[PDB]
């Protein structure tokens, strides 16, 4: 196994996958690392198994069809993994916890949103369709763009949104276009 957490790249108390070399902190893995389960398989492995069981799941899809899917177990897992892929980027720190807004010339967003809120919402099964999860994720970055305006800090929202979007297209096998 690896000697650092796959998500945050730090050592510490790690849980090791039994079917690949990755390791995780307890609350870095999504879902949080399961109490027992021997052997234990991480989310990367669980996602790889879905693909292997249904190879045609990698054929191209339309985003509109994906967003309307109900959050059955496999869609729940894919949203978990997509959220995890965002936390894997160190720039996710800016978007993890509950923000506050007091900048001369700007007003805070009507609907604040942050990664740990989306994490909670997933854990509590609050999304009935994929669309709920993707809307809240895209709202994080949109709120950041609107608030920071012409400050160059706006770029952090662009950067982390790009990671989100690339991974959304990968995980849900969105049809490639020009
Ligand atoms: Zn970690
Ligand atoms: Zn694994
Ligand atoms: Zn099949």
With b meaning 16 or more CB within 10 Å and e meaning fewer, what string describes 156-171?
Answer: bbeebbebbeebbbeb
Ion ligand 1 — residues with CB < 5 Å: 5, 7-8, 25, 28
Ligand 2 center to 98 CA (angstroms): 30
For residue 16, the ligand closest to its alpha carbon is: 2
Same domain, 115 and 129: yes
Q: What is the DSSP letter of 41?
A: -
Ligand 3 center to 53 CA (angstroms): 6
Ligand 3 center to 62 CA (angstroms): 19
Same domain, 146 and 104: yes
Same domain, 1 and 79: no
Alpha helices in 32-126 (DSSP H): 43-53, 63-67, 73-88, 93-96, 115-123
What gap in Å lies between CA 19 and CA 14, rounded to an integer?
A: 15
70 φ/ψ angles, rounded to the nearest 5 degrees = -65, 150
For residue 50, the ligand closest to its alpha carbon is: 3
Expressed in Å, this structure's resolution amounts to 1.7
Report the DSSP pairing between strands 23-24 and 15-16: antiparallel
Ligand 1 center to 24 CA (angstroms): 6
Q: Which CATH number is 112's domain given?
A: 1.20.920.10
61 φ/ψ angles, rounded to the nearest 5 degrees = -125, 155
Cis status of the peptide bond prior to 31, with omega within 30 of 0: yes
Same domain, 50 and 96: no
Ligand 2 center to 104 CA (angstroms): 47
Cα–Cα separations (whole angstroms), residue 29 to 90, 135, 166: 15, 22, 20
What gap in Å lies between CA 40 and CA 33, rounded to an integer?
A: 9
Same domain, 97 and 112: yes
Ligand 2 center to 32 CA (angstroms): 14
What gap in Å lies between CA 9 and CA 18, rounded to an integer?
A: 19
Same domain, 43 and 74: no
Q: Where in the sequence is the domain holding 27, given as residue range(s)?
A: 1-59
Identify which of 119, 131, 126, 128 has the alpha carbon closest to the alpha carbon of residue 95: 119
Ligand 2 center to 177 CA (angstroms): 31
3-state secondary structure 123-168: HCCCCCEHHHHHHHHHHHHHHHHHHHCCCCCHHHHHHHHHHHHHHH
Same domain, 31 and 106: no
For residue 40, the ligand closest to its alpha carbon is: 2
Same domain, 47 and 67: no
């Amino acid at each position: 196994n690896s000697n650092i957490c796959e998500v945050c790249n730090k050592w510490g108390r790690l849980f090791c996958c039994d079917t690949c070399p990755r390791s995780f902190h307890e609350h870095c893995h999504i879902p949080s690392v399961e109490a027992n389960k021997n052997p234990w398989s991480c989310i990367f492995c669980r996602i790889k198994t879905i693909q292997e069981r249904c190879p045609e799941s990698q054929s191209g899809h339309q985003e509109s069809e994906v967003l309307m899917r109900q959050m059955l177990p496999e869609e729940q897992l894919k949203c978990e993994f997509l959220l995890l892929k965002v936390y894997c980027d160190s720039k996710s720190c800016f978007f993890a916890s509950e923000p506050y807004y007091n900048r001369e010339g700007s007003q805070g967003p009507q609907k604040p949103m942050w990664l740990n809120k989306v994490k909670t919402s997933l854990n509590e099964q609050m999304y009935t369709r994929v669309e709920g999860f993707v809307q809240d994720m895209r709202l994080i970055f949109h709120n950041h763009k609107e608030f920071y305006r012409e400050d160059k800090f706006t770029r952090l929202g662009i950067q982390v949104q790009d990671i989100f979007e690339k991974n959304f297209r990968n995980i849900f096998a969105i049809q490639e276009t020009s």
